[PDB]
Each structure stands twice: as structure tokens, then as C-alpha cells.
Design a protein around this nucleic acid. Structure first.
Ligand SMILES: [Mg+2]
Ligand SMILES: [Mg+2]
Ligand SMILES: [Mg+2]
Ligand SMILES: [Mg+2]
Ligand code: NA
Length: 326
DNA sequence: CGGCATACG
DNA sequence: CGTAT
DNA sequence: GCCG
């Protein structure tokens, strides 16, 4: 088992679901307390289990696996022996965890804002609605639409949204293309948002595109919220039988020369990209981001034509999106 | 021990 | 500060 | 919390 998540296939569904979910609870709780190092380790340990070819049934099977030390091993041991881990259950039922989870799930609210509100004594969404002076317009949108945004987005919803985005993109810039990214490109059947990447085959033609797209979507009555650039974080109005629902949609524009890097970054998973960038810098001496791959010794950028190119240039076996579910 | 991904709105 | 993968 |  290699130590970096980008060195091993990680499928969407796997053989250690309960064990990984418990470790991910501890990762999430670590983040609510600002402990980014412990969040990473618990996330990494969870991802190792997702990469295994069969269920862990005995503690001996953790020996030699990366990112399993005393703490993550004890969690697994308790789950295997009793079906429950006391630490995990204590976190799950704690007022701090449940409220930070509730608050951070609001669009426009992060850990720092949620923590401040928690310390001020706030606990519920109605507590927040009773004091709109404390809210940004973004938070107001997130709170107004919270119920809809808590409902899973389905793959049928994605097809409908892609068509309306393509329509607006086609008027804004003929020949521009729309690619589905994020979790749905990795094969997820549900999600909490839809992610798209837009480019144009002629380098430079994509300049100024996203304002033109957003203006056209807003004119069509499809935009319930947006920030108004090259990234937009929108709430869309999606038709439903006899009504509609609010859906989070993210749009990204990249020049075609950067498209492989932007596609790689936007396809994720989040942990996969963190691990890939860590691997690039620490093992290969190259600096990876959503725009390119930089050799800081020669001061040159690697021209990729495909994701396959990028994996080859990092000396990694290629992984299709469906195997990047770290 | 230091390090833990990286960018844009 | 927020957002995203 | 774990790795190198
Ligand atoms: Mg997504
Ligand atoms: Mg998104
Ligand atoms: Mg230390
Ligand atoms: Mg997200
Ligand atoms: Na949030």
C-alpha cells in the first residue's frame, strides 16, 4: 500500500465503508477544532481503507498500512470488537459537533464563522434568521435556500442543468464547451452541487466569458443567487414536477492550454488533489496547481495535452476519474 | 522536529 | 473572511 | 495524527 492517495486506485464504493465513515467523523471534528494536521491523518487513514481489496476483519490486517498509528488503529479495533467506537459516538452526539456541522453546511459559513456563532451561544438556523444584521448577502442566500441545498442532487438533475448551461455558453461564445467535473465525473450518483468547466478551442477566446454566461443565465430567470472573473458559485433554479428546487452550481473557465490541469483539479477528490500536489512537490520537486505544473529549477511550465500527460510527467500510473475517490 | 495543497471571489 | 476540487 |  503506497503512502500517497494518488499512487493507488480508490473506487467510489468499497469494502470498508463503516470503518472509513468513523475515521471521517474524527477528521471532520478535528477540522471543527482547527486541527488541520489531525484532519489530514484521519482523512488519509480513511482513504487507505477505501483502497483495500476486501474487508478488514482483524487488527493484524492494519500492520504495515500507512497512516495507521495508535489512534486510528484503536478506533478500528473498537469497531471490530464491539461494533462501535466510544470516541466516535461521543463526538457524534456532542453539541459542539452537531452545531458546527449544521452551521458549516450553510453556503457562506465556514469553520471560523460557525465557531464564533457557537461561542456567542447560537445553536439553530432560526437563531441565525432572528439576527439578519449578522449575515452577509451570501449567508442570507445560503440560509434562505438551506433546505433545498440539503436535498441530494441526482444524476437526472445534472443532465438538465448541463443543457441550460450549454445553451447560455453557446450564445455567450459559439464553440465554447462545457465539461461535467467534480464528484459526478468520478461516478457519484448524488451530490450536493454540480461542477462544470468551460473552455474554448482557440486560446484566448475564453477571456471575459464568464460574465457573459452569468448575464444570460440571469436573464433567463435561472439564477437565484450569484456573486455579481473565472469562477462562479451559483444557486440555480432547477425545474421539478409542478415546481422547482434550488441547486448549487459551480462554473469554472480556463484557457484550453490549461484545460488538462483545470480538469484534473476540478475532478478531485479534494483529498486526491491535496495528495497529488503534495506528491508533486515533495517527491518530484514540481509545483502543481489548477493552471499548470512548474519546474522551479528550470523555471518552465510543462505543456500538457491531457490528464494522461500530467500523470506521466509525475511518474504516476494513470487513474481514471472513477478511481480518484480518495 | 517540520510538514501537512492550492488557488480564486 | 468565503468558495472550490 | 502520522511520516520521513
Ligand atoms: Mg461538487
Ligand atoms: Mg462544487
Ligand atoms: Mg509535532
Ligand atoms: Mg465541496
Ligand atoms: Na459552508
Amino acid at each position: 500500500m503506497p503512502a500517497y492517495a494518488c499512487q493507488r486506485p480508490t473506487p467510489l464504493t468499497h469494502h470498508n465503508t463503516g470503518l472509513s465513515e468513523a475515521l471521517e467523523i474524527l477528521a471532520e471534528a478535528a477540522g471543527f477544532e482547527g486541527s488541520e494536521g489531525r484532519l489530514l491523518t484521519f482523512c488519509r487513514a480513511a482513504s487507505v481503507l477505501k483502497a483495500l481489496p476486501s474487508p478488514v476483519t482483524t487488527l493484524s490486517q492494519l500492520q504495515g498500512l500507512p497512516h495507521f498509528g495508535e489512534h486510528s488503529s484503536r478506533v478500528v479495533q473498537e469497531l471490530l470488537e464491539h461494533g462501535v467506537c466510544e470516541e466516535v459516538e461521543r463526538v457524534r452526539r456532542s453539541e459542539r459537533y452537531q452545531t458546527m456541522k449544521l452551521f458549516t453546511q450553510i453556503f457562506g459559513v465556514g469553520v471560523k464563522t460557525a465557531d464564533r456563532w457557537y461561542r456567542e451561544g447560537l445553536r439553530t438556523l432560526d437563531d441565525l434568521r432572528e439576527q439578519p444584521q449578522k449575515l452577509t448577502q451570501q449567508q442570507k442566500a445560503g440560509l434562505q435556500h438551506h433546505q433545498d441545498l440539503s436535498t441530494p442532487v441526482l444524476r437526472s438533475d445534472v443532465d438538465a442543468l448541463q443543457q441550460v448551461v450549454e445553451e447560455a455558453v453557446g450564445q455567450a461564445l459559439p464553440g465554447a464547451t462545457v465539461t461535467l467535473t467534480g464528484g459526478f465525473r468520478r461516478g457519484k450518483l448524488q451530490g450536493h452541487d454540480v461542477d462544470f468547466l468551460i473552455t474554448h478551442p482557440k486560446e484566448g477566446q475564453e477571456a471575459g466569458l464568464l460574465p457573459r454566461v452569468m448575464c444570460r443565465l440571469q436573464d433567463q430567470g435561472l439564477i437565484l443567487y450569484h456573486q455579481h472573473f473565472e469562477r462562479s458559485f451559483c444557486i440555480f433554479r432547477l425545474p421539478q414536477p409542478g415546481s422547482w428546487k434550488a441547486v448549487r452550481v459551480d462554473l469554472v473557465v480556463a484557457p484550453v492550454s490549461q484545460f488538462p490541469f483545470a480538469l484534473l483539479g476540478a475532478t478531485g477528490s479534494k483529498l486526491f488533489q491535496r495528495e497529488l500536489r503534495r506528491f508533486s512537490r515533495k517527491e518530484k520537486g514540481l509545483w502543481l496547481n489548477s493552471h499548470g505544473l512548474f519546474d522551479p529549477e528550470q523555471k518552465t511550465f510543462f505543456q500538457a495535452a491531457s490528464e494522461e500527460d500530467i500523470f506521466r510527467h509525475l511518474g504516476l500510473e494513470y487513474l481514471p476519474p472513477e478511481q480518484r475517490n480518495a
